[PDB]
PDB file of C-alpha atoms and ligand atoms in Angstrom:
ATOM      1  CA  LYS O 283      -0.116   0.010   0.287  1.00 28.57           C
ATOM      2  CA  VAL O 284       1.153   3.623  -0.814  1.00 26.66           C
ATOM      3  CA  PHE O 285      -0.106   5.823   1.866  1.00 25.19           C
ATOM      4  CA  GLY O 286      -1.154   9.224   1.801  1.00 23.23           C
ATOM      5  CA  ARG O 287       0.516  11.853   3.613  1.00 21.16           C
ATOM      6  CA  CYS O 288      -2.207  12.727   5.860  1.00 23.40           C
ATOM      7  CA  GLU O 289      -3.153   9.364   5.581  1.00 23.92           C
ATOM      8  CA  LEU O 290       0.120   7.898   7.398  1.00 23.55           C
ATOM      9  CA  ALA O 291       0.589  10.659   9.661  1.00 24.11           C
ATOM     10  CA  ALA O 292      -3.086   9.736  10.842  1.00 22.50           C
ATOM     11  CA  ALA O 293      -2.220   6.524  11.342  1.00 21.91           C
ATOM     12  CA  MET O 294       0.971   6.677  12.699  1.00 26.18           C
ATOM     13  CA  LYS O 295      -0.776   9.017  15.500  1.00 26.94           C
ATOM     14  CA  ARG O 296      -3.783   6.517  15.880  1.00 31.11           C
ATOM     15  CA  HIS O 297      -0.873   3.622  16.949  1.00 33.15           C
ATOM     16  CA  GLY O 298       1.124   6.342  19.613  1.00 34.07           C
ATOM     17  CA  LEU O 299       3.774   7.120  17.171  1.00 33.24           C
ATOM     18  CA  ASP O 300       3.131  10.978  17.549  1.00 32.70           C
ATOM     19  CA  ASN O 301       5.689  12.436  20.471  1.00 32.03           C
ATOM     20  CA  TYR O 302       7.021   9.123  21.318  1.00 34.91           C
ATOM     21  CA  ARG O 303      10.308   8.959  22.929  1.00 31.21           C
ATOM     22  CA  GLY O 304       9.863  12.918  22.205  1.00 28.19           C
ATOM     23  CA  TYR O 305       9.812  12.601  18.440  1.00 29.12           C
ATOM     24  CA  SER O 306       7.013  14.743  17.163  1.00 28.48           C
ATOM     25  CA  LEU O 307       4.686  13.279  14.342  1.00 31.92           C
ATOM     26  CA  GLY O 308       6.114  14.910  11.465  1.00 31.55           C
ATOM     27  CA  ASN O 309       9.855  13.448  12.214  1.00 31.32           C
ATOM     28  CA  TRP O 310       8.126  10.204  11.669  1.00 32.57           C
ATOM     29  CA  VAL O 311       6.491  11.214   8.387  1.00 32.83           C
ATOM     30  CA  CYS O 312       9.760  12.926   7.147  1.00 34.53           C
ATOM     31  CA  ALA O 313      11.268   9.453   7.942  1.00 32.78           C
ATOM     32  CA  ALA O 314       8.690   7.452   6.208  1.00 30.86           C
ATOM     33  CA  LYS O 315       8.822   9.749   2.852  1.00 34.30           C
ATOM     34  CA  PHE O 316      12.404   9.014   2.699  1.00 32.66           C
ATOM     35  CA  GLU O 317      12.878   5.767   3.789  1.00 31.68           C
ATOM     36  CA  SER O 318       9.960   4.167   1.730  1.00 32.70           C
ATOM     37  CA  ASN O 319       8.178   7.169  -0.375  1.00 30.30           C
ATOM     38  CA  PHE O 320       5.421   5.896   2.036  1.00 31.40           C
ATOM     39  CA  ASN O 321       5.187   2.586   0.500  1.00 31.08           C
ATOM     40  CA  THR O 322       4.649  -0.261   2.486  1.00 37.80           C
ATOM     41  CA  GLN O 323       6.071  -2.523   0.135  1.00 45.56           C
ATOM     42  CA  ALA O 324       9.439  -1.347   0.276  1.00 47.18           C
ATOM     43  CA  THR O 325      12.417  -3.395   0.168  1.00 44.24           C
ATOM     44  CA  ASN O 326      16.098  -2.306  -0.142  1.00 41.84           C
ATOM     45  CA  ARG O 327      19.063  -4.938   0.305  1.00 44.45           C
ATOM     46  CA  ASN O 328      22.300  -3.501   2.549  1.00 43.32           C
ATOM     47  CA  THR O 329      25.713  -4.156   1.502  1.00 39.49           C
ATOM     48  CA  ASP O 330      25.931  -6.570   4.607  1.00 41.16           C
ATOM     49  CA  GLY O 331      23.317  -8.800   2.919  1.00 40.93           C
ATOM     50  CA  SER O 332      20.556  -7.963   5.324  1.00 41.87           C
ATOM     51  CA  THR O 333      17.424  -6.339   4.087  1.00 45.59           C
ATOM     52  CA  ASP O 334      15.125  -3.123   4.725  1.00 43.33           C
ATOM     53  CA  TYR O 335      11.330  -3.793   4.850  1.00 40.23           C
ATOM     54  CA  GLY O 336       8.277  -1.373   4.796  1.00 41.54           C
ATOM     55  CA  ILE O 337       7.301   2.041   5.498  1.00 41.46           C
ATOM     56  CA  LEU O 338      10.418   2.711   7.606  1.00 36.68           C
ATOM     57  CA  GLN O 339      12.844   0.533   6.028  1.00 36.38           C
ATOM     58  CA  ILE O 340      13.464  -1.624   9.393  1.00 34.35           C
ATOM     59  CA  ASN O 341      16.396  -3.774   9.036  1.00 38.36           C
ATOM     60  CA  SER O 342      16.754  -7.769   9.178  1.00 38.33           C
ATOM     61  CA  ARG O 343      20.254  -7.383  10.790  1.00 41.60           C
ATOM     62  CA  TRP O 344      18.569  -6.920  14.070  1.00 39.99           C
ATOM     63  CA  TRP O 345      14.914  -6.504  14.215  1.00 41.24           C
ATOM     64  CA  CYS O 346      13.059  -8.996  11.897  1.00 42.19           C
ATOM     65  CA  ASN O 347      13.507 -12.431  10.718  1.00 44.85           C
ATOM     66  CA  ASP O 348      14.162 -13.022   6.955  1.00 44.85           C
ATOM     67  CA  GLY O 349      15.723 -16.507   6.796  1.00 43.65           C
ATOM     68  CA  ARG O 350      18.187 -15.133   4.971  1.00 45.95           C
ATOM     69  CA  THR O 351      20.695 -12.951   6.955  1.00 42.58           C
ATOM     70  CA  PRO O 352      23.104 -15.155   8.753  1.00 42.23           C
ATOM     71  CA  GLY O 353      23.975 -14.037  12.249  1.00 41.82           C
ATOM     72  CA  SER O 354      21.109 -11.945  12.516  1.00 41.02           C
ATOM     73  CA  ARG O 355      18.936 -10.841  15.312  1.00 38.80           C
ATOM     74  CA  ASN O 356      15.061 -10.825  15.371  1.00 38.18           C
ATOM     75  CA  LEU O 357      14.625  -8.375  18.457  1.00 36.82           C
ATOM     76  CA  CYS O 358      10.861  -6.955  17.352  1.00 37.44           C
ATOM     77  CA  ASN O 359       9.889 -11.041  17.170  1.00 37.03           C
ATOM     78  CA  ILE O 360       8.477 -10.994  14.006  1.00 36.59           C
ATOM     79  CA  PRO O 361       8.907 -12.092   9.879  1.00 38.34           C
ATOM     80  CA  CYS O 362      10.034  -9.283   8.000  1.00 39.14           C
ATOM     81  CA  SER O 363       7.044 -10.110   5.647  1.00 37.04           C
ATOM     82  CA  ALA O 364       4.877  -8.257   8.586  1.00 33.88           C
ATOM     83  CA  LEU O 365       6.640  -5.078   8.111  1.00 35.03           C
ATOM     84  CA  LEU O 366       5.026  -4.882   4.160  1.00 34.84           C
ATOM     85  CA  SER O 367       1.393  -5.441   5.439  1.00 31.80           C
ATOM     86  CA  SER O 368      -1.335  -2.456   4.292  1.00 30.52           C
ATOM     87  CA  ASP O 369      -1.661  -2.587   7.936  1.00 31.16           C
ATOM     88  CA  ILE O 370       1.293  -0.926   9.665  1.00 28.68           C
ATOM     89  CA  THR O 371       0.863  -1.921  13.274  1.00 29.13           C
ATOM     90  CA  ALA O 372       3.889  -4.054  13.264  1.00 27.16           C
ATOM     91  CA  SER O 373       6.315  -1.825  11.410  1.00 29.29           C
ATOM     92  CA  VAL O 374       4.896   0.806  14.058  1.00 30.95           C
ATOM     93  CA  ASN O 375       5.205  -1.574  16.908  1.00 30.97           C
ATOM     94  CA  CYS O 376       8.956  -2.549  15.709  1.00 32.42           C
ATOM     95  CA  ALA O 377       9.560   0.968  15.319  1.00 29.49           C
ATOM     96  CA  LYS O 378       8.770   1.900  18.820  1.00 32.01           C
ATOM     97  CA  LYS O 379      11.601  -0.615  19.706  1.00 34.03           C
ATOM     98  CA  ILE O 380      14.242   0.775  17.451  1.00 34.38           C
ATOM     99  CA  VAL O 381      13.853   4.073  18.990  1.00 35.55           C
ATOM    100  CA  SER O 382      14.135   3.237  22.350  1.00 35.82           C
ATOM    101  CA  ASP O 383      17.490   1.539  21.876  1.00 35.12           C
ATOM    102  CA  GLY O 384      19.453   4.503  22.617  1.00 34.75           C
ATOM    103  CA  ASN O 385      20.253   6.355  19.793  1.00 34.41           C
ATOM    104  CA  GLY O 386      16.716   7.666  19.004  1.00 34.55           C
ATOM    105  CA  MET O 387      15.633   8.330  15.613  1.00 33.18           C
ATOM    106  CA  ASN O 388      19.555   8.398  14.460  1.00 28.05           C
ATOM    107  CA  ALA O 389      18.676   4.507  14.019  1.00 29.83           C
ATOM    108  CA  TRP O 390      17.351   5.983  10.514  1.00 34.51           C
ATOM    109  CA  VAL O 391      20.299   7.523   8.705  1.00 36.07           C
ATOM    110  CA  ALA O 392      17.736   9.346   5.838  1.00 37.96           C
ATOM    111  CA  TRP O 393      16.203  10.686   8.957  1.00 37.18           C
ATOM    112  CA  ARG O 394      19.495  12.161  10.260  1.00 35.34           C
ATOM    113  CA  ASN O 395      20.471  13.000   6.791  1.00 36.72           C
ATOM    114  CA  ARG O 396      17.156  14.725   5.503  1.00 38.11           C
ATOM    115  CA  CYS O 397      14.712  15.110   8.711  1.00 39.11           C
ATOM    116  CA  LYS O 398      16.850  16.159  11.583  1.00 42.28           C
ATOM    117  CA  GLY O 399      17.086  19.832  12.476  1.00 38.27           C
ATOM    118  CA  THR O 400      14.785  20.643   9.657  1.00 37.93           C
ATOM    119  CA  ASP O 401      11.026  21.828   9.773  1.00 37.28           C
ATOM    120  CA  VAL O 402       9.380  18.653  10.253  1.00 38.89           C
ATOM    121  CA  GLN O 403       5.913  20.171  11.175  1.00 40.20           C
ATOM    122  CA  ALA O 404       5.591  20.765   7.376  1.00 41.56           C
ATOM    123  CA  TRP O 405       5.254  17.022   6.684  1.00 43.42           C
ATOM    124  CA  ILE O 406       1.844  17.047   8.634  1.00 43.22           C
ATOM    125  CA  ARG O 407       0.690  20.486   7.446  1.00 43.07           C
ATOM    126  CA  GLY O 408      -2.824  20.931   6.719  1.00 43.76           C
ATOM    127  CA  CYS O 409      -3.615  17.248   7.992  1.00 40.42           C
ATOM    128  CA  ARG O 410      -6.961  17.009  10.133  1.00 41.67           C
ATOM    129  CA  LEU O 411      -5.338  15.108  13.213  1.00 38.94           C
TER     130      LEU O 411
HETATM  131  O1  IKX M 227       1.152  11.516  -4.234  1.00 40.55           O
HETATM  132  C1  IKX M 227       1.192  12.427  -3.522  1.00 40.55           C
HETATM  133  O2  IKX M 227       2.078  13.841  -3.825  1.00 40.55           O
HETATM  134  C2  IKX M 227      -0.173  12.678  -2.796  1.00 40.55           C
HETATM  135  C3  IKX M 227      -0.808  11.846  -2.313  1.00 40.55           C
HETATM  136  C4  IKX M 227      -1.467  11.760  -1.530  1.00 40.55           C
HETATM  137  N1  IKX M 227      -2.785  10.817  -1.065  1.00 40.55           N
HETATM  138  C5  IKX M 227      -3.851  11.004  -0.526  1.00 40.55           C
HETATM  139  C6  IKX M 227      -4.636   9.725  -0.641  1.00 40.55           C
HETATM  140  C7  IKX M 227      -6.091   9.383  -0.409  1.00 40.55           C
HETATM  141  C8  IKX M 227      -5.872   8.846   1.360  1.00 40.55           C
HETATM  142  O3  IKX M 227      -6.895   8.368   1.854  1.00 40.55           O
HETATM  143  N2  IKX M 227      -3.948   8.665  -1.310  1.00 40.55           N
HETATM  144  N3  IKX M 227      -2.576   9.452  -1.612  1.00 40.55           N
HETATM  145  C9  IKX M 227      -1.852  12.973  -0.568  1.00 40.55           C
HETATM  146  C10 IKX M 227      -0.721  13.714  -0.536  1.00 40.55           C
HETATM  147  C11 IKX M 227      -0.455  14.980   0.211  1.00 40.55           C
HETATM  148  O4  IKX M 227      -1.142  15.197   1.052  1.00 40.55           O
HETATM  149  O5  IKX M 227       0.355  15.669  -0.472  1.00 40.55           O
HETATM  150  N4  IKX M 227       0.227  13.473  -1.738  1.00 40.55           N
HETATM  151  O1  IKX M 228      -1.239  17.325  -4.565  1.00 39.49           O
HETATM  152  C1  IKX M 228      -0.084  16.595  -4.478  1.00 39.49           C
HETATM  153  O2  IKX M 228      -0.288  16.418  -3.464  1.00 39.49           O
HETATM  154  C2  IKX M 228       0.954  16.683  -5.299  1.00 39.49           C
HETATM  155  C3  IKX M 228       1.039  17.324  -6.336  1.00 39.49           C
HETATM  156  C4  IKX M 228       2.417  17.701  -6.869  1.00 39.49           C
HETATM  157  N1  IKX M 228       2.190  18.192  -8.603  1.00 39.49           N
HETATM  158  C5  IKX M 228       3.645  18.680  -9.017  1.00 39.49           C
HETATM  159  C6  IKX M 228       2.989  18.756 -10.355  1.00 39.49           C
HETATM  160  C7  IKX M 228       3.880  19.869 -11.400  1.00 39.49           C
HETATM  161  C8  IKX M 228       3.783  21.039 -11.364  1.00 39.49           C
HETATM  162  O3  IKX M 228       2.544  22.377 -11.449  1.00 39.49           O
HETATM  163  N2  IKX M 228       1.663  18.923 -10.100  1.00 39.49           N
HETATM  164  N3  IKX M 228       1.725  18.445  -9.387  1.00 39.49           N
HETATM  165  C9  IKX M 228       3.508  17.215  -6.433  1.00 39.49           C
HETATM  166  C10 IKX M 228       3.371  16.418  -5.274  1.00 39.49           C
HETATM  167  C11 IKX M 228       4.445  16.090  -4.456  1.00 39.49           C
HETATM  168  O4  IKX M 228       5.620  15.860  -4.872  1.00 39.49           O
HETATM  169  O5  IKX M 228       4.371  15.776  -3.455  1.00 39.49           O
HETATM  170  N4  IKX M 228       1.863  16.035  -4.783  1.00 39.49           N
HETATM  171  O1  IKX M 229       2.413  19.677  -1.525  1.00 41.21           O
HETATM  172  C1  IKX M 229       2.582  18.713  -1.303  1.00 41.21           C
HETATM  173  O2  IKX M 229       1.699  18.151  -2.119  1.00 41.21           O
HETATM  174  C2  IKX M 229       3.618  17.954  -0.362  1.00 41.21           C
HETATM  175  C3  IKX M 229       4.084  18.510   0.289  1.00 41.21           C
HETATM  176  C4  IKX M 229       5.321  17.764   0.800  1.00 41.21           C
HETATM  177  N1  IKX M 229       5.995  18.708   2.161  1.00 41.21           N
HETATM  178  C5  IKX M 229       7.250  18.102   2.459  1.00 41.21           C
HETATM  179  C6  IKX M 229       7.963  19.352   2.936  1.00 41.21           C
HETATM  180  C7  IKX M 229       8.903  19.483   3.841  1.00 41.21           C
HETATM  181  C8  IKX M 229      10.621  19.829   3.176  1.00 41.21           C
HETATM  182  O3  IKX M 229      10.460  20.053   1.661  1.00 41.21           O
HETATM  183  N2  IKX M 229       7.018  20.097   2.592  1.00 41.21           N
HETATM  184  N3  IKX M 229       6.024  19.870   2.061  1.00 41.21           N
HETATM  185  C9  IKX M 229       4.915  16.510   1.253  1.00 41.21           C
HETATM  186  C10 IKX M 229       4.336  15.651   0.070  1.00 41.21           C
HETATM  187  C11 IKX M 229       3.849  14.400   0.196  1.00 41.21           C
HETATM  188  O4  IKX M 229       4.389  13.718   1.031  1.00 41.21           O
HETATM  189  O5  IKX M 229       3.037  14.242  -0.500  1.00 41.21           O
HETATM  190  N4  IKX M 229       3.498  16.369  -0.634  1.00 41.21           N
HETATM  191 CL1   CL M 230      -3.355  11.609   2.776  1.00 40.31          CL
HETATM  192 CL1   CL M 231       5.729  17.970  13.816  1.00 44.66          CL
HETATM  193 CL1   CL M 232      18.126 -15.374   8.771  1.00 44.65          CL
HETATM  194 CL1   CL M 233      17.079 -14.654  -1.355  1.00 44.24          CL
HETATM  195 CL1   CL M 234      16.848 -12.292  18.652  1.00 43.07          CL
HETATM  196 CL1   CL M 235       9.522 -15.878  10.878  1.00 43.51          CL
HETATM  197 CL1   CL M 236      -2.665   1.521   9.036  1.00 43.44          CL
HETATM  198 CL1   CL M 237      16.054  10.920  21.386  1.00 46.80          CL
HETATM  199 CL1   CL M 238      19.046  -0.822  13.119  1.00 50.72          CL
HETATM  200 EU1  EU3 M 239       2.006  15.561  -2.235  1.00 51.33          EU
HETATM  201 NA1   NA M 240       3.565  17.771  16.368  1.00 50.67          NA
HETATM  202 NA1   NA M 241       9.241 -14.957  13.435  1.00 55.10          NA
END
């Protein structure tokens, strides 16, 4: 599923991501735009052989099981395919674990490089939330 901007903002808010660990909703929408273009079916292979999955490009090196990342962990206790669903629940619940691990949203390199320190509220401007 390819979400609309406000559509994704509303889903993320409903699932408790607005201000989670202090990150306002716009930060999460910005991250998703540059990680996946709001497409839940996004995948990308990393140089180390792990793969990133879903709207927030969650990595199989640590967070999910894809059966093809030797030596990896599955800290969200989910198949990586769950992260591609039209329902963002699994991605949101896993993102909450990620952002709580100590480095906040710097875990998302695209957030650090394209969202951090920018006017992220622009990403939710005009939405009925
Ligand atoms: O493709 C776009 O740029 C786009 C698509 C959008 N939508 C909205 C929907 C309907 C939601 O139910 N689907 N794509 C919304 C926006 C935007 O708010 O800038 N932009
Ligand atoms: O309606 C939109 O949400 C929308 C329209 C866009 N455009 C761009 C053009 C060309 C110039 O007028 N026309 N609609 C571009 C985008 C976007 O990149 O998010 N969004
Ligand atoms: O005007 C739009 O259609 C629009 C503006 C957006 N943004 C993003 C920013 C932040 C920095 O450029 N400001 N407006 C994002 C989107 C979209 O994702 O469809 N659409
Ligand atoms: Cl929308
Ligand atoms: Cl915001
Ligand atoms: Cl594996
Ligand atoms: Cl393969
Ligand atoms: Cl594990
Ligand atoms: Cl599994
Ligand atoms: Cl959803
Ligand atoms: Cl933080
Ligand atoms: Cl990570
Ligand atoms: Eu648009
Ligand atoms: Na906000
Ligand atoms: Na699993």
